[PDB]
Amino acid sequence: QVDVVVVGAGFAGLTAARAVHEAGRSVLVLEARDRVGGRTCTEEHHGTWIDLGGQWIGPGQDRVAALAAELGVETYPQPTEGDDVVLFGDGEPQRAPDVALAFSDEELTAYLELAGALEAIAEKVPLDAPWLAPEAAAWDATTLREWVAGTGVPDRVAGLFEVAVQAVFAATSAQLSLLHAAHYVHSAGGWSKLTDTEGGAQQDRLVGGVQPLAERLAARLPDGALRLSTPVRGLAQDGDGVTVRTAGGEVRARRAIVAVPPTLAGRIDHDPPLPPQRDQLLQHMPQGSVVKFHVIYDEPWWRAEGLSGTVLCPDEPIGVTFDGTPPAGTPGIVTGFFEGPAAVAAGARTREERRDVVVDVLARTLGERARDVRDYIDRDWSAEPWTRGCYGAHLPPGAWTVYGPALRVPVGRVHWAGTETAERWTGYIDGAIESGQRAAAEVLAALG
């Protein structure tokens, strides 16, 4: 017997359980994995931390900054200095201190028009009810790719825009409804907030990585509250409480918080069954496709050449890269992503085949010293059974307006959390925490 069972020890699950323990209520956290952090995962390699999942926090992300300060974790800034390389479908790799300077006069004007036109739509989309936007019906009936085609923008602008879209959504402009993209932009506070390093979501990292931050949040839970290696298979409820079925136990609670990715929330045996609109919503919330990698070098060699370690390649399998070198200055790390179709193709291949593809791109852009590789570590989040895709769900056309209203509504004694339910910074560590705080409040109120 306990008051609240939380399913998932992500930042959402942990946030909710901690709020509930502090109001003095009994709480169990059932986590499928042998660890906490979920879509945040940190491993120790070559005497430093390797963030295989979520790794960056930025300005406007007040909850994860508050949590990092409170638990004693310091931040370091994402290296920003030196030349970025851009390589288009044709021509040579271009060096410039800013990605923007690679574009022509007419092209940069078109890219800022496009970015401004998109934020204007974004500001009309309510964060708590994207389906109540005044033009929701037409915006949900259109892909992001069809809207971009409609603006009359040249190919080289649509090219670099699509690299940024796949970097942010882990999906192509063709998979996303315009309304989903608009809502996501609005939830971040604009396009600059999503794409920028300095003054944006990629500004800062955590010293020791992010999974350690989660492990400190877990330490604040009482002894016996956290149950690792304990998948939830079943969730029954009646007029008196909820029974959670695991591999060979039942837990009884008054109320429940499900804090898993949408695709996984639908895989649980609900009794009674979930109402129709909520089951179909989960079927219309597919997770993205990403393979995150780190290429390990003895030194961050590109710094001496005046390079940032950032390359941008619209016509390549690798979208975008960052200097991932820790504050000590060694080892050298180049961090990068396969996004969307490129992630699905590379997930079918071996780690070693994926290493060869990454190093070929870097040799052509950063230079020949990209081949002196000390190690290669990557992670296909589509292959993780307890995530089934990063960064989080996108919604294709027709999904927000028809099924979307069932996103947060509790079903009897069962409440929903996870970053996909957040109003602000949806898809980010920040959004997960907001979601944990909301769900804890609804539950604390209802127990009363």
Added chain:
Amino acid sequence: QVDVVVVGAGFAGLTAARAVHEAGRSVLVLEARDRVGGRTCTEEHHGTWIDLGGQWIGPGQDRVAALAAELGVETYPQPTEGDDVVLFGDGEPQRAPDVALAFSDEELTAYLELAGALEAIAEKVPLDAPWLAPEAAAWDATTLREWVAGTGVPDRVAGLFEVAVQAVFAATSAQLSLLHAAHYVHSAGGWSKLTDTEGGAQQDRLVGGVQPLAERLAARLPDGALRLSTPVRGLAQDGDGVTVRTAGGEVRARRAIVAVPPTLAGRIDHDPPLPPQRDQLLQHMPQGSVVKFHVIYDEPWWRAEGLSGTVLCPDEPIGVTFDGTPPAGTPGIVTGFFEGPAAVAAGARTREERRDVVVDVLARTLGERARDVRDYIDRDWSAEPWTRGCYGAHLPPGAWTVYGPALRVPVGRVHWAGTETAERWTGYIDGAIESGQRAAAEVLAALG
């Protein structure tokens, strides 16, 4: 240990099991419901059969026609005589000998070039590998809605077309990729095949309903081979065979056929985990949304007025209606559907609210005598835990080309069936049967 374990006792599972049984191999069929038939379901009300699920067969559908003949189930024609009624927005209702004769000559002509153009794309799309169509990249990056608009047809014809798209797909023009819609059309052999009564998919019905035919197919198996009320929770495999975990215990086989809808196949605890391309495919194959109803009257009072009982109302919540009166000529029945968005809105309401909306549409079209209703029977197939939407799965933009190639590929000892894996009449009973025949052939070859 048996030769083959089949998951699902729909037409796909029962066809695969009977073909494995005829070839001399041991077979077990595990079904979650207390009945066979899946998306076909027949109940007795008012001294006749009510098809709550699939009810129609037509010319072209040679697998269902041969099964009905072999197990001795008779057909009767869908009634067609009498004036159809068409109603447009605030306007008054119009009688004509046929639906198509309430449209100007230039309108009827725009409609048939549109159908014609769709068929032209359809015939370029290979039935077994739509991802290999010559403009596959371009047709998978586009909605059917964007193709209808950029065709440039007029407004009152795109609205007639939307009714038909929703009758066929149980999903709007905006939710479907052009490649998915084209494949479907090829699969059925053209647009008249999908839409027409005489000469198409709604030509014939089965005396006594469709579930009894599924029962006669099930009776070809030995005692103990079919297990009802036995949902499959787990499917594990190794180098020597497969293990099925159910509430009751375990079943071991050499090979498995999974013949459930794509959404439910993904909810099985697979061990090892499914490969990422196949898990993410299932996340991108959501079921349609449909509520199917039969309005019961003492007599088919509309025939006495020279009406067919078919209404087309492009602006109303219900799609097309049919005369569902059986051959004895009583009771009077009007059959129809809420499709896509209107099915989700109606699913959220009560049986009495849905009845009121249907009777209101029929009152203003067939006449005011429709309000004196003896009974109203419907089923929201979205609310069925063991289906989760009819008529079947659709694919949104970007899914066929990126995730689609894993649709039929066996994962070690686990083979795939269900109407969604059919090449011909995908989405129909006929396609369910083809998938079972192909799945049984594949597994018998892989045993040796």
